[PDB]
Each structure stands twice: as structure tokens, then as C-alpha cells.
């Protein structure tokens, strides 16, 4: 890959839509206003980081509860 | 587990949006503290106050 310092490409090119809450170690919420996909999940069973659908069903409630 | 350590035990209350690279929201619903920031300037990760007003707006924007 192009190193970060040089890349103008939004980090998330594509999202995945079938990530279950139970397999998520954390969601990383990137501070990238200019890009459509800001949410990256780190997964528990494989430790991949996958960009996820921000409309995934469980995401909103998971985020709101973190803040209570 | 009684074994299980919550990754965040203490938080910073004075972190502003501009000094954050990203937030990590830890899937540890059991724990009081679930919010981590990687800092630009430092590159340290710190746990941050979850009642920080800007955190809400930050997360809502990410969801659109
Ligand atoms: O809607 C959810 O966030 C959710 C639904 C499911 O019961 C489960 O996810 S799964 O469909 O991927 O299996 C998960 O629910 C619970 C879950 O039992 C625990 N979280 S998890 O291990 O990461 O999956 C539990 O401690 O909290 C989840 C619900 O959130 S809560 O508000 O803290 O109770 O997620
Ligand atoms: O905008 C960002 O904050 C960011 C963008 C990159 O896509 C990401 O790459 S990475 O997650 O594979 O490393 C970058 O690096 C961070 C990342 O937030 C964290 N990884 S984690 O430990 O699983 O959460 C971070 O804590 O470590 C990475 C730093 O990379 S490094 O400088 O080359 O060592 O985050």
C-alpha cells in the first residue's frame, strides 16, 4: 500500500455488512469528515479490521450505550 | 470473569475533538469506561470522559 503520509484516498474503500456485535472487539471511529466510511471494526475471532456499514443494525445502540 | 480487567480504569476530561485521530469504543459493555482516543500530537491512547459533549456529535456524524 501507499504509505499513509502520502495517501489521499479515504482509508475505507468498501464496507462489510455481516459483522455480528459478538465478534467485535472495538469500533474505531476515524476522524475523517471528508469520507463516507468512518467506522472500522476490530474482530475478536480473527483480529482483522474491517470497515463496516454505518447502518448496521446494532451500531447506534452500541454507541449510545457507551456514553449512556 | 472476576479475573477480567476493564481496559479503561481512569479517564481524561480535557480532550478536545481537534486533538483526536480516532475514537475506539470498546466492546466491554460491563465497564464504566468504554471510550479510548488516539491522540494526534502524542500518538498516546488515553481513556476519555464518555460524557464529553463533543463525543456525542462526533459519533452522530459518523453514523450518517
Ligand atoms: O443488539 C446488540 O447489540 C446485540 C445483540 C445480541 O444479543 C448479541 O450479538 S450477537 O447477535 O452478535 O450474538 C449482543 O448482545 C449482548 C451480548 O450478549 C453481549 N455483548 S457481546 O458479547 O459483544 O455480543 C452483552 O454483554 O451485551 C449485548 C447487548 O448490549 S447491552 O446494552 O450492553 O446489554 O449484541
Ligand atoms: O486515522 C487513524 O487513526 C488510523 C488509520 C489507519 O487505517 C490505522 O491502521 S491500523 O489500525 O492497522 O494500525 C491507524 O493506525 C493505528 C490504529 O488506530 C490502532 N490499531 S489497534 O491497536 O488495533 O487499535 C493503533 O492503536 O495503532 C495504529 C498505529 O500504526 S502505526 O503508527 O504504524 O504503528 O489508525
mmCIF file of C-alpha atoms and ligand atoms in Angstrom:
data_model
loop_
_atom_site.group_PDB
_atom_site.id
_atom_site.type_symbol
_atom_site.label_atom_id
_atom_site.label_comp_id
_atom_site.label_asym_id
_atom_site.label_seq_id
_atom_site.Cartn_x
_atom_site.Cartn_y
_atom_site.Cartn_z
ATOM 1 C CA UNK A 1 0.000 0.000 0.000
ATOM 2 C CA UNK A 2 0.823 3.676 -0.401
ATOM 3 C CA UNK A 3 2.125 4.875 2.998
ATOM 4 C CA UNK A 4 -0.357 6.937 4.999
ATOM 5 C CA UNK A 5 1.662 10.120 4.859
ATOM 6 C CA UNK A 6 1.280 10.070 1.052
ATOM 7 C CA UNK A 7 -2.237 8.655 0.543
ATOM 8 C CA UNK A 8 -5.147 10.969 -0.411
ATOM 9 C CA UNK A 9 -7.528 8.047 -0.523
ATOM 10 C CA UNK A 10 -10.165 7.638 2.160
ATOM 11 C CA UNK A 11 -8.949 4.651 4.278
ATOM 12 C CA UNK A 12 -12.167 2.704 3.846
ATOM 13 C CA UNK A 13 -12.858 1.912 0.182
ATOM 14 C CA UNK A 14 -15.592 -0.689 0.872
ATOM 15 C CA UNK A 15 -17.679 -1.795 3.851
ATOM 16 C CA UNK A 16 -18.875 -5.280 5.006
ATOM 17 C CA UNK A 17 -22.484 -5.795 6.145
ATOM 18 C CA UNK A 18 -22.478 -9.019 8.058
ATOM 19 C CA UNK A 19 -20.464 -8.336 11.185
ATOM 20 C CA UNK A 20 -22.146 -9.541 14.315
ATOM 21 C CA UNK A 21 -21.845 -7.465 17.515
ATOM 22 C CA UNK A 22 -20.424 -10.511 19.471
ATOM 23 C CA UNK A 23 -17.441 -10.743 17.126
ATOM 24 C CA UNK A 24 -16.433 -7.062 17.617
ATOM 25 C CA UNK A 25 -13.518 -6.232 19.914
ATOM 26 C CA UNK A 26 -13.990 -2.416 19.424
ATOM 27 C CA UNK A 27 -15.183 0.049 16.814
ATOM 28 C CA UNK A 28 -12.660 2.601 15.745
ATOM 29 C CA UNK A 29 -14.452 5.865 14.604
ATOM 30 C CA UNK A 30 -11.940 7.672 12.391
ATOM 31 C CA UNK A 31 -11.704 11.391 12.488
ATOM 32 C CA UNK A 32 -12.157 11.708 8.703
ATOM 33 C CA UNK A 33 -15.095 14.154 7.989
ATOM 34 C CA UNK A 34 -14.305 14.125 4.182
ATOM 35 C CA UNK A 35 -15.065 10.345 3.846
ATOM 36 C CA UNK A 36 -18.285 8.311 3.847
ATOM 37 C CA UNK A 37 -16.985 5.368 5.802
ATOM 38 C CA UNK A 38 -15.623 6.298 9.267
ATOM 39 C CA UNK A 39 -16.260 3.057 11.177
ATOM 40 C CA UNK A 40 -13.671 0.207 11.449
ATOM 41 C CA UNK A 41 -14.291 -2.890 13.494
ATOM 42 C CA UNK A 42 -11.580 -4.914 15.117
ATOM 43 C CA UNK A 43 -12.834 -8.513 15.258
ATOM 44 C CA UNK A 44 -12.393 -10.897 18.120
ATOM 45 C CA UNK A 45 -12.059 -14.307 16.353
ATOM 46 C CA UNK A 46 -9.582 -13.245 13.717
ATOM 47 C CA UNK A 47 -8.320 -9.798 14.653
ATOM 48 C CA UNK A 48 -8.905 -8.344 11.160
ATOM 49 C CA UNK A 49 -10.025 -4.747 10.998
ATOM 50 C CA UNK A 50 -12.935 -4.368 8.613
ATOM 51 C CA UNK A 51 -14.714 -1.189 7.546
ATOM 52 C CA UNK A 52 -18.403 -1.672 8.335
ATOM 53 C CA UNK A 53 -21.758 -0.481 7.152
ATOM 54 C CA UNK A 54 -22.574 2.547 9.422
ATOM 55 C CA UNK A 55 -26.254 1.474 9.045
ATOM 56 C CA UNK A 56 -25.524 -2.000 10.503
ATOM 57 C CA UNK A 57 -28.440 -2.574 12.899
ATOM 58 C CA UNK A 58 -26.726 -2.815 16.220
ATOM 59 C CA UNK A 59 -24.226 0.058 15.786
ATOM 60 C CA UNK A 60 -26.315 3.046 17.043
ATOM 61 C CA UNK A 61 -27.372 1.384 20.238
ATOM 62 C CA UNK A 62 -23.862 0.106 20.925
ATOM 63 C CA UNK A 63 -22.561 3.729 20.540
ATOM 64 C CA UNK A 64 -25.318 5.400 22.571
ATOM 65 C CA UNK A 65 -24.781 2.936 25.464
ATOM 66 C CA UNK A 66 -21.023 3.684 25.598
ATOM 67 C CA UNK A 67 -21.987 7.272 26.504
ATOM 68 C CA UNK A 68 -25.056 6.142 28.431
ATOM 69 C CA UNK B 1 -14.757 -13.376 34.795
ATOM 70 C CA UNK B 2 -13.760 -11.781 38.152
ATOM 71 C CA UNK B 3 -10.372 -12.151 36.506
ATOM 72 C CA UNK B 4 -11.382 -9.698 33.762
ATOM 73 C CA UNK B 5 -9.758 -6.253 33.890
ATOM 74 C CA UNK B 6 -11.704 -3.400 32.283
ATOM 75 C CA UNK B 7 -9.068 -1.848 29.854
ATOM 76 C CA UNK B 8 -10.107 1.691 30.970
ATOM 77 C CA UNK B 9 -9.802 2.289 34.725
ATOM 78 C CA UNK B 10 -9.188 6.043 34.641
ATOM 79 C CA UNK B 11 -10.200 8.843 32.120
ATOM 80 C CA UNK B 12 -9.001 12.339 30.903
ATOM 81 C CA UNK B 13 -11.710 15.033 30.962
ATOM 82 C CA UNK B 14 -9.955 17.686 28.864
ATOM 83 C CA UNK B 15 -9.533 16.188 25.396
ATOM 84 C CA UNK B 16 -10.935 18.257 22.503
ATOM 85 C CA UNK B 17 -12.159 16.954 19.138
ATOM 86 C CA UNK B 18 -9.270 18.572 17.161
ATOM 87 C CA UNK B 19 -6.621 16.631 19.148
ATOM 88 C CA UNK B 20 -8.213 13.242 18.296
ATOM 89 C CA UNK B 21 -7.109 10.962 15.427
ATOM 90 C CA UNK B 22 -9.783 8.451 16.285
ATOM 91 C CA UNK B 23 -12.012 7.087 19.000
ATOM 92 C CA UNK B 24 -12.129 3.361 19.867
ATOM 93 C CA UNK B 25 -15.343 2.230 21.560
ATOM 94 C CA UNK B 26 -14.508 -0.945 23.373
ATOM 95 C CA UNK B 27 -16.978 -3.832 23.293
ATOM 96 C CA UNK B 28 -16.928 -4.079 27.120
ATOM 97 C CA UNK B 29 -20.473 -3.010 27.981
ATOM 98 C CA UNK B 30 -19.915 -4.165 31.612
ATOM 99 C CA UNK B 31 -17.283 -1.468 32.229
ATOM 100 C CA UNK B 32 -17.955 2.131 33.144
ATOM 101 C CA UNK B 33 -15.330 3.384 30.671
ATOM 102 C CA UNK B 34 -15.513 2.228 27.038
ATOM 103 C CA UNK B 35 -14.046 5.190 25.143
ATOM 104 C CA UNK B 36 -10.401 5.485 24.091
ATOM 105 C CA UNK B 37 -8.874 8.289 21.965
ATOM 106 C CA UNK B 38 -5.673 8.066 19.951
ATOM 107 C CA UNK B 39 -4.197 11.478 20.193
ATOM 108 C CA UNK B 40 -2.578 13.488 17.428
ATOM 109 C CA UNK B 41 0.465 15.292 18.846
ATOM 110 C CA UNK B 42 1.104 12.444 21.360
ATOM 111 C CA UNK B 43 0.052 9.273 19.493
ATOM 112 C CA UNK B 44 -0.728 8.044 23.074
ATOM 113 C CA UNK B 45 -4.002 6.312 23.636
ATOM 114 C CA UNK B 46 -5.934 7.676 26.591
ATOM 115 C CA UNK B 47 -9.360 6.766 28.070
ATOM 116 C CA UNK B 48 -11.608 9.815 27.873
ATOM 117 C CA UNK B 49 -14.688 11.054 29.716
ATOM 118 C CA UNK B 50 -17.739 9.499 27.986
ATOM 119 C CA UNK B 51 -19.961 12.494 28.981
ATOM 120 C CA UNK B 52 -17.915 14.834 26.853
ATOM 121 C CA UNK B 53 -20.477 16.725 24.764
ATOM 122 C CA UNK B 54 -18.477 16.710 21.609
ATOM 123 C CA UNK B 55 -18.202 12.886 21.679
ATOM 124 C CA UNK B 56 -21.914 12.648 21.023
ATOM 125 C CA UNK B 57 -21.841 14.927 17.965
ATOM 126 C CA UNK B 58 -18.700 13.104 16.696
ATOM 127 C CA UNK B 59 -20.416 9.728 16.793
ATOM 128 C CA UNK B 60 -23.689 11.033 15.264
ATOM 129 C CA UNK B 61 -21.734 12.405 12.342
ATOM 130 C CA UNK B 62 -20.022 9.062 11.777
ATOM 131 C CA UNK B 63 -23.385 7.369 11.599
ATOM 132 C CA UNK B 64 -24.916 9.489 8.766
HETATM 133 O O1 LIG C 1 -28.028 -5.739 19.601
HETATM 134 C C1 LIG C 1 -26.905 -5.943 20.115
HETATM 135 O O2 LIG C 1 -26.062 -5.041 20.363
HETATM 136 C C2 LIG C 1 -26.532 -7.391 20.464
HETATM 137 C C3 LIG C 1 -27.454 -8.442 20.224
HETATM 138 C C4 LIG C 1 -27.093 -9.931 20.542
HETATM 139 O O3 LIG C 1 -27.772 -10.448 21.691
HETATM 140 C C5 LIG C 1 -25.567 -10.098 20.763
HETATM 141 O O4 LIG C 1 -24.870 -10.119 19.498
HETATM 142 S S1 LIG C 1 -24.857 -11.200 18.522
HETATM 143 O O5 LIG C 1 -26.140 -11.272 17.752
HETATM 144 O O6 LIG C 1 -23.695 -10.808 17.717
HETATM 145 O O7 LIG C 1 -24.616 -12.540 19.149
HETATM 146 C C6 LIG C 1 -25.071 -8.920 21.621
HETATM 147 O O8 LIG C 1 -25.955 -8.859 22.773
HETATM 148 C C7 LIG C 1 -25.474 -8.638 24.103
HETATM 149 C C8 LIG C 1 -24.402 -9.731 24.261
HETATM 150 O O9 LIG C 1 -24.945 -10.937 24.889
HETATM 151 C C9 LIG C 1 -23.190 -9.148 24.981
HETATM 152 N N1 LIG C 1 -22.420 -8.338 24.007
HETATM 153 S S2 LIG C 1 -21.430 -9.206 23.027
HETATM 154 O O10 LIG C 1 -20.774 -10.342 23.674
HETATM 155 O O11 LIG C 1 -20.346 -8.359 22.487
HETATM 156 O O12 LIG C 1 -22.215 -9.750 21.876
HETATM 157 C C10 LIG C 1 -23.702 -8.304 26.196
HETATM 158 O O13 LIG C 1 -22.742 -8.268 27.395
HETATM 159 O O14 LIG C 1 -24.335 -7.030 25.718
HETATM 160 C C11 LIG C 1 -25.061 -7.156 24.424
HETATM 161 C C12 LIG C 1 -26.259 -6.195 24.402
HETATM 162 O O15 LIG C 1 -25.840 -4.855 24.858
HETATM 163 S S3 LIG C 1 -26.126 -4.260 26.178
HETATM 164 O O16 LIG C 1 -26.935 -2.997 26.019
HETATM 165 O O17 LIG C 1 -24.865 -3.877 26.894
HETATM 166 O O18 LIG C 1 -26.853 -5.281 27.041
HETATM 167 O O19 LIG C 1 -25.276 -7.607 20.999
HETATM 168 O O1 LIG C 2 -6.798 7.532 11.393
HETATM 169 C C1 LIG C 2 -6.340 6.691 12.204
HETATM 170 O O2 LIG C 2 -6.296 6.900 13.424
HETATM 171 C C2 LIG C 2 -5.792 5.307 11.705
HETATM 172 C C3 LIG C 2 -5.784 4.940 10.335
HETATM 173 C C4 LIG C 2 -5.243 3.553 9.842
HETATM 174 O O3 LIG C 2 -6.218 2.942 8.938
HETATM 175 C C5 LIG C 2 -4.863 2.675 11.095
HETATM 176 O O4 LIG C 2 -4.083 1.428 10.829
HETATM 177 S S1 LIG C 2 -4.026 0.288 11.833
HETATM 178 O O5 LIG C 2 -5.265 0.248 12.710
HETATM 179 O O6 LIG C 2 -3.829 -1.043 11.127
HETATM 180 O O7 LIG C 2 -2.801 0.428 12.703
HETATM 181 C C6 LIG C 2 -4.182 3.647 12.110
HETATM 182 O O8 LIG C 2 -3.183 3.015 12.995
HETATM 183 C C7 LIG C 2 -3.396 2.815 14.427
HETATM 184 C C8 LIG C 2 -4.759 2.151 14.823
HETATM 185 O O9 LIG C 2 -5.682 3.185 15.139
HETATM 186 C C9 LIG C 2 -4.666 1.329 16.082
HETATM 187 N N1 LIG C 2 -4.550 -0.144 15.808
HETATM 188 S S2 LIG C 2 -5.206 -1.021 17.102
HETATM 189 O O10 LIG C 2 -4.109 -1.124 18.131
HETATM 190 O O11 LIG C 2 -5.692 -2.407 16.777
HETATM 191 O O12 LIG C 2 -6.373 -0.209 17.607
HETATM 192 C C10 LIG C 2 -3.464 1.955 16.805
HETATM 193 O O13 LIG C 2 -3.716 1.847 18.222
HETATM 194 O O14 LIG C 2 -2.174 1.505 16.200
HETATM 195 C C11 LIG C 2 -2.086 2.046 14.826
HETATM 196 C C12 LIG C 2 -0.839 2.952 14.531
HETATM 197 O O15 LIG C 2 0.007 2.461 13.410
HETATM 198 S S3 LIG C 2 1.476 2.730 13.395
HETATM 199 O O16 LIG C 2 1.737 4.211 13.620
HETATM 200 O O17 LIG C 2 2.090 2.311 12.082
HETATM 201 O O18 LIG C 2 2.166 1.928 14.480
HETATM 202 O O19 LIG C 2 -5.308 4.422 12.643
#
